[PDB]
Paper text:
Saposins are lipid transfer proteins required for the degradation of sphingolipids in the lysosome. These small proteins bind lipids by transitioning from a closed, monomeric state to an open conformation exposing a hydrophobic surface that binds and shields hydrophobic lipid tails from the aqueous environment. Saposins are required for sphingolipid degradation by lysosomal hydrolases; in particular, [name] acts as a co-factor for the enzyme β-galactosylceramidase (GALC) by solubilising its galactosphingolipid substrates. Although individual saposins have low sequence identity (less than 35%), they adopt a common fold consisting of four amphipathic α-helices.
Here we present the crystal structure of a unique tetrameric assembly of murine saposin A produced serendipitously, following modifications of published protocols for making lipoprotein nanodiscs. Four [name] molecules in an open conformation form a diamond-shaped assembly possessing three orthogonal two-fold rotation axes. This symmetry is not perfect as the individual monomers possess small differences in the conformations of loop regions and the C-terminal helix (RMSDs 0.8–1.4 Å over 80 Cα residues), resulting in non-crystallographic symmetry of the tetramer. Each chain of the tetramer interacts directly with the three other chains burying a total surface area of 1210 Å2 for each monomer, representing approximately 20% of the [name] surface. The equivalent dimer within the tetramer structure is very different, possessing a head-to-head arrangement of monomers and substantial direct protein-protein interactions. Comparison of these structures suggests that the tetrameric assembly of [name] is not compatible with binding to GALC without some structural rearrangement. The core of the [name] tetramer structure is hollow and potentially solvent-accessible if it is not filled with amphipathic molecules. Considering the highly hydrophobic nature of the internal [name] surface, exposure of this hollow core to solvent would be thermodynamically unfavourable. It is therefore likely that disordered PC and/or DDM molecules are present in this internal cavity.
Numbering used by the authors:
A (entry chain B), B (entry chain C), C (entry chain D), D (entry chain A): 1 to 80
Write the structure that this text describes.
């Protein structure tokens, strides 16, 4: 069905952007820069450690949730 | 930037949703059913007359949108 | 849980915006002006009759559904 | 006009969502639990210390990028 096939396609491209290693690093380097919004050299360092450590895990979580589009658009009742 | 293909694709596939002659019938029948929520036999007819006449005009006007990404995807976060 | 708490809050606050009578006329004048897009003195008059009669009903129906966020976010299944 | 009035309304209420002190704590408690997605008493604690400290900073930019929808919706081609 067309609203299911489009939703599946959109979800597929969201997967393709999150797998893009340049996009993976853009968010990483962005949240690294976010840490510098507080001058604290110890907290900005600890922030960079947390960001660098958790974001690849979080991206893996979203990639694992963006896989199998049929199960995503179904949980949107856009599919059967 | 690459996410501009997303803005292009989402708009393009949504365009194919409105351009789908079958989807044009799906949206019509829901707004037709909306007319029957009032028992007035004169108003239910007049609503169907307005819906059958105006909705294709509304779809075509909105079809006039989403046609060219240059005036919609331009100057936002996904292409600039 | 947060995905439920956000959904409930968004639907509840958007509902109260739709209950704010200023929002009703904002939408109303668009559909009233929409009636002038077909040069039909009987249908453009009838269009306002359909718009002025059905839009307050439809807004009240949607306002009536957004009054209970529990049944709306359940229609997103995010609270289960 | 509705494409401008929608952006003005959405940005204003989206701002009001982040301004809600219940939403302010809910985002923390989700990200606090997010730190527990890595079973580490040393790193998850350092994450919780970072989360409680930086989340108010993140809200400030987004609130600041919502303290006037008219100047943002205009630079998105949505108003003028």
């Amino acid at each position: 069905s067309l609203p299911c096939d489009i939703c599946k396609t959109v979800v597929t491209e969201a997967g393709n952007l999150l797998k893009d290693n340049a996009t993976q690093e853009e968010i990483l380097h962005y949240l690294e820069k976010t840490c510098e919004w507080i001058h604290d050299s110890s907290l900005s360092a600890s922030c960079k450690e947390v960001v660098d450590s958790y974001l690849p895990v979080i991206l893996d979580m979203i990639k694992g949730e963006m896989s199998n589009p049929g199960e995503v658009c179904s949980a949107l009742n856009l599919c059967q």
